Amino acid sequence: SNGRDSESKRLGAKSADGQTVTGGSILYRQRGTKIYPGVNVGIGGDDTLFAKVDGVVRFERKGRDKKQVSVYPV
Amino acid sequence: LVPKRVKHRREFRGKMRGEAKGGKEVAFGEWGLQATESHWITNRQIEAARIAMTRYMKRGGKVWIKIFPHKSYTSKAIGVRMGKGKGAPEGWVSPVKRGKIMFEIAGVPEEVAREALRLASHKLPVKTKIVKRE
Amino acid sequence: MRVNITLECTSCKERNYLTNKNKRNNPDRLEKQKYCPRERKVTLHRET
Amino acid sequence: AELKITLKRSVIGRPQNQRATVKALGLGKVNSTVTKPANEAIKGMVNTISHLVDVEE
RNA sequence: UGAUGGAGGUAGAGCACUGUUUGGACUAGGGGCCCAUCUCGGGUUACCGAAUUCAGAUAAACUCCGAAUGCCAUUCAUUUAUAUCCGGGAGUCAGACUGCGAGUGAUAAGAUCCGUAGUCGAAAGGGAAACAGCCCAGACCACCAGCUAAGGUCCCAAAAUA
RNA sequence: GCGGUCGCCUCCUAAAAGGUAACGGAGGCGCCCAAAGGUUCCCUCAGAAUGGUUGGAAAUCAUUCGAAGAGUGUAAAGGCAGAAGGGAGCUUGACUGCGAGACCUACAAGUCGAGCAGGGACGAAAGUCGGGCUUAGUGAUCCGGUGGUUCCGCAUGGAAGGGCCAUCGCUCAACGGAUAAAAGCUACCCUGGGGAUAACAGGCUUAUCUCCCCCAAGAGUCCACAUCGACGGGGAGGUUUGGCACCUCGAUGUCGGCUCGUCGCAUCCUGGGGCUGUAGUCGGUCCCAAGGGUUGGGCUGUUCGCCCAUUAAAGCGGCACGCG
RNA sequence: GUGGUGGCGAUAGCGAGAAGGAUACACCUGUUCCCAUGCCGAACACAGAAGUUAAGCUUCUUAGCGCCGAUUGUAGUGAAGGGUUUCCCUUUGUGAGAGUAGGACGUCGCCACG
Numbered sequence: 060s061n062g063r064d065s066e067s068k069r070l071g072a073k074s075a076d077g078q079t080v081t082g083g084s085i086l087y088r089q090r091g092t093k094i095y096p097g098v099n100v101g102i103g104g105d106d107t108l109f110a111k112v113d114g115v116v117r118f119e120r121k122g123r124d125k126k127q128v129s130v131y132p133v
Numbered sequence: 134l135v136p137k138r139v140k141h142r143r144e145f146r147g148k149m150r151g152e153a154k155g156g157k158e159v160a161f162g163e164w165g166l167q168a169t170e171s172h173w174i175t176n177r178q179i180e181a182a183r184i185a186m187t188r189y190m191k192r193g194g195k196v197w198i199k200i201f202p203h204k205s206y207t208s209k210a211i212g213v214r215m216g217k218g219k220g221a222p223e224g225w226v227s228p229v230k231r232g233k234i235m236f237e238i239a240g241v242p243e244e245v246a247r248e249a250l251r252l253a254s255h256k257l258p259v260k261t262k263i264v265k266r267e
Numbered sequence: 268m269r270v271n272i273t274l275e276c277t278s279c280k281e282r283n284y285l286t287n288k289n290k291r292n293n294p295d296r297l298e299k300q301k302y303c304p305r306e307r308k309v310t311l312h313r314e315t
Numbered sequence: 316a317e318l319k320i321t322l323k324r325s326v327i328g329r330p331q332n333q334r335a336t337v338k339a340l341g342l343g344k345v346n347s348t349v350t351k352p353a354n355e356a357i358k359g360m361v362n363t364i365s366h367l368v369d370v371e372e
Numbered sequence: 373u374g375a376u377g378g379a380g381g382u383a384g385a386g387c388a389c390u391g392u393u394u395g396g397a398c399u400a401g402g403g404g405c406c407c408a409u410c411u412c413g414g415g416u417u418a419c420c421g422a423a424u425u426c427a428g429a430u431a432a433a434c435u436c437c438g439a440a441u442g443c444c445a446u447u448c449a450u451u452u453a454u455a456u457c458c459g460g461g462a463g464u465c466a467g468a469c470u471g472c473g474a475g476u477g478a479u480a481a482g483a484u485c486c487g488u489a490g491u492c493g494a495a496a497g498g499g500a501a502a503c504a505g506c507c508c509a510g511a512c513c514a515c516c517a518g519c520u521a522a523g524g525u526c527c528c529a530a531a532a533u534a
Numbered sequence: 535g536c537g538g539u540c541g542c543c544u545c546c547u548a549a550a551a552g553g554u555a556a557c558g559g560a561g562g563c564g565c566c567c568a569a570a571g572g573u574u575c576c577c578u579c580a581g582a583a584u585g586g587u588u589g590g591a592a593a594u595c596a597u598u599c600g601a602a603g604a605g606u607g608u609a610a611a612g613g614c615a616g617a618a619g620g621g622a623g624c625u626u627g628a629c630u631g632c633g634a635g636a637c638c639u640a641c642a643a644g645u646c647g648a649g650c651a652g653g654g655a656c657g658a659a660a661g662u663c664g665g666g667c668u669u670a671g672u673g674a675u676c677c678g679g680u681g682g683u684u685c686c687g688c689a690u691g692g693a694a695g696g697g698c699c700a701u702c703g704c705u706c707a708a709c710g711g712a713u714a715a716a717a718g719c720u721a722c723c724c725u726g727g728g729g730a731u732a733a734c735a736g737g738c739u740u741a742u743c744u745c746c747c748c749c750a751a752g753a754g755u756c757c758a759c760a761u762c763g764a765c766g767g768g769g770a771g772g773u774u775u776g777g778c779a780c781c782u783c784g785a786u787g788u789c790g791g792c793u794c795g796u797c798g799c800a801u802c803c804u805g806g807g808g809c810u811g812u813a814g815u816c817g818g819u820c821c822c823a824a825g826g827g828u829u830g831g832g833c834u835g836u837u838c839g840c841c842c843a844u845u846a847a848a849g850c851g852g853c854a855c856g857c858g
Numbered sequence: 859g860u861g862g863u864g865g866c867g868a869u870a871g872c873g874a875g876a877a878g879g880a881u882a883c884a885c886c887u888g889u890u891c892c893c894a895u896g897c898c899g900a901a902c903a904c905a906g907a908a909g910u911u912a913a914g915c916u917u918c919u920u921a922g923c924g925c926c927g928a929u930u931g932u933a934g935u936g937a938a939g940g941g942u943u944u945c946c947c948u949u950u951g952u953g954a955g956a957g958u959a960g961g962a963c964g965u966c967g968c969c970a971c972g
């Protein structure tokens with residue numbers, strides 16, 4: 060019998076590229092590393108990308124087929 | 134005609150819009166039957182068309198059935214109210230969109246080919262036309 | 268059979284840590300080196 | 316240079332963005348007119364609600 | 373609203389993976405069948421045929437690809453004038469239809485369940501004969517003034533027997 | 535009503551942010567690991583080909599090809615071959631006090647978190663470690679148990695009994711949990727409401743049903759089409775079996791029969807005509823035709839149906855299955 | 859020129875073929891040494907310089923594979939509309955995938971030895 064489902068986890072990006080964010084802000088929720096942590100960006104125990112420092116968020120491409128998030132202080 | 138296996142027992146009815154993605158030109162045979170409208174085609178209809186075509190050809194030449202009834206459709210028995218899950222699988226259809234070449238034939242003179250395709254078309258639920266290999 | 272257990276500091280007899288163990292795989296009382304906040308140093312904690 | 320924009324169509328039954336675009340341009344009742352600079356933003360707003368307004372120089 | 377930068381895998385498309393699948397080439401192997409058996413050593417059906425390869429399809433739970441939009445953000449630009457927060461007072465938790473995108477249904481229902489926009493709900497007025505939900509359009513009032521929208525102009529019945 | 539479901543995780547539905555329903559389409563969870571955790575170092579798979587005793591398709595061995603076609607405790611998705619997969623050494627960070635700032639969110643909760651301090655594991659060092667590739671493996675309060683406690687102690691000292699910190703007792707699984715504790719009948723029934731919600735009829739729909747067609751394989755000695763017409767395809771009707779729940783529950787009386795009829799034609803008889811596998815008498819089929827007519831009984835509440843006896847015929851339907 | 863070490867999406871790759879070791883890097887000689895093989899000095903570690911470009915390695919040629927990829931056209935689609943409205947069409951904007959012209963056998967740095 061069908062009819063079951065789990066609560067949506069509100070994954071995805073939580074901060075836009077070029078946005079200023081304070082240290083510790085969550086930048087991306089994900090299962091696995093869909094996007095990798097770049098400069099000044101840490102990855103949590105459940106693959107959540109957060110900013111280690113205050114700065115502007117940037118989404119870049121890590122090589123040919125991988126994405127990445129960096130936080131650049133001003 | 135029925136698939137040997139299906140990943141999912143039940144499937145969406147779907148939507149048929151636009152021309153066929155591929156197979157709009159006669160590939161193998163010398164003549165082909167092209168559908169000018171979009172419509173479901175049941176395995177029963179395919180078999181009826183195939184029998185008509187082959188029998189008129191006298192089982193000579195060669196016949197190709199380009200379409201296959203991949204999709205399944207369910208139904209609910211009379212006297213059953215709405216709800217309580219999806220109905221049990223009933224039959225098999227191929228969604229055919231206009232421009233698709235449903236049948237091809239070869240190894241037969243043009244008059245025989247045209248007549249055989251005409252009989253098959255009358256069995257099918259779509260309006261059709263005859264096309265020659267390019 | 269897996270069950271929750273308490274690890275108590277052998278020095279001050281303070282029930283400090285909560286964990287669990289499979290009895291079949293670890294029949295004997297578990298022992299670890301864990302920080303004891305009361306004594307503020309690492310000590311031998313044994314299951315009770 | 317300048318654009319004289321006049322509202323020739325009602326806003327009843329229109330998407331909120333189109334209604335808001337009319338409001339932002341500053342038009343009110345039907346046949347209400349306004350004059351705006353011919354900026355890219357203004358021309359974009361005119362294009363967004365082109366079917367509701369008439370534009371002169 | 374424009375400019376810029378982004379995140380994402382939909383429409384479409386595609387076969388690079390996974391299912392479904394057509395024909396051709398070849399064949400392991402399987403089936404018959406004989407001789408000869410020590411089932412054993414072969415020769416056969418243009419019998420069924422894996423795997424490979426050539427060509428050709430297919431997909432909500434396939435993707436080598438991949439939009440239009442929508443979304444997030446910018447001490448940005450133009451226009452506009454709202455947004456937060458704190459507190460007093462509520463009502464609302466039966467929705468309906470229409471257009472569009474899906475599911476359930478039978479690609480039925482004035483069916484049902486969502487997303488989305490509009491109207492009704494709470495909206496009078498003009499058209500659709502009558503006709504809440506369609507099209508045009510938002511009544512603060514007076515006028516025996518004028519211009520138009522949808523829709524219309526032979527008579528009922530205003531306006532072209534243009 | 536019966537059946538199914540109730541909480542949590544994953545996918546599709548879901549319409550390329552997020553979120554998004556159905557008794558929609560699929561699966562899982564109520565754990566497991568003392569290493570399957572941490573760290574240092576090191577390693578790269580699955581299959582195929584070829585060769586090789588037991589040994590055979592396939593045990594173990596060797597070369598080559600082989601970018602992942604393996605594996606990742608456990609569903610799926612996402613991710614991982616700079617490993618998160620695999621092996622070894624040492625270890626217990628599966629640490630204590632926290633925590634700027636975020637995500638999520640009605641609340642209660644849930645999620646991530648750099649960084650500081652204490653004291654450590656591994657490593658030369660860099661540095662990593664607040665469990666496990668990530669996302670389920672869980673349960674409020676009250677009440678009670680156990681341990682700790684420089685907290686309180688009803689005149690005072692104690693005590694009893696409480697507080698605080700730690701942690702245990704939930705298939706409270708109807709999983710935000712009515713109570714420590716609970717199953718049935720009512721046609722003897724009653725009240726408050728609803729056409730928000732069923733049964734009759736109406737309405738919408740037409741899958742089904744009835745009727746009419748298309749193609750023509752066959753049957754018909756030959757011959758598709760006198761007649762019948764497979765496998766298939768397309769419509770009309772609103773009499774059937776159904777679907778929906780839009781009017782009616784401060785009442786729309788519900789079968790059959792009787793009285794009275796009226797209407798539709800998809801015509802039962804009578805009237806006209808075409809075709810015939812129409813010699814004649816009979817017929818078959820089709821076309822036109824609704825003017826009139828279209829029964830008396832046995833059985834059964836019956837409709838229907840069977841039977842008896844007639845008739846030119848003993849039509850089919852609508853009218854709230856017409857008409858209380 | 860060679861050897862370290864990097865940046866940039868493989869346009870840096872793969873395949874095939876050719877040249878060189880002067881130096882350098884390598885193979886290469888041994889296990890006495892620290893160290894090691896779930897067996898093997900094959901590997902790892904150590905000591906050394908008999909021989910070789912054989913291989914790797916670097917340089918070069920090649921478009922066979924992989925990679926990058928314009929324009930045009932089309933599907934799709936925002937907005938505004940129409941129709942005989944499951945669907946289809948019109949105006950305006952945007953515009954793929956596929957297919958192809960073509961590009962490409964890398965470039966931009968630092969250091970040591972020449």
Ligand SMILES: [K+]
Pocket residue numbers: 254255256257258259260261
């Ligand atoms: K047809």
Ligand SMILES: [K+]
Pocket residue numbers: none
């Ligand atoms: K898809």
Ligand SMILES: [K+]
Pocket residue numbers: none
């Ligand atoms: K709607």
Ligand SMILES: [K+]
Pocket residue numbers: none
């Ligand atoms: K280890």
Ligand SMILES: [K+]
Pocket residue numbers: 708
């Ligand atoms: K309950």
Ligand SMILES: [K+]
Pocket residue numbers: 721
């Ligand atoms: K009784």
Ligand SMILES: [K+]
Pocket residue numbers: 734735854
């Ligand atoms: K009635």
Ligand SMILES: [K+]
Pocket residue numbers: 740
């Ligand atoms: K019908």
Ligand SMILES: [K+]
Pocket residue numbers: 746747769
């Ligand atoms: K008909």
Ligand SMILES: [K+]
Pocket residue numbers: 757
């Ligand atoms: K005949």
Ligand SMILES: [K+]
Pocket residue numbers: 782783785
């Ligand atoms: K009633």
Ligand SMILES: [K+]
Pocket residue numbers: none
């Ligand atoms: K009657």
Ligand SMILES: [K+]
Pocket residue numbers: none
């Ligand atoms: K006759």
Ligand SMILES: [K+]
Pocket residue numbers: 824825
């Ligand atoms: K009559």
Ligand SMILES: [K+]
Pocket residue numbers: none
């Ligand atoms: K009787």
Ligand SMILES: [K+]
Pocket residue numbers: 858
């Ligand atoms: K009565």
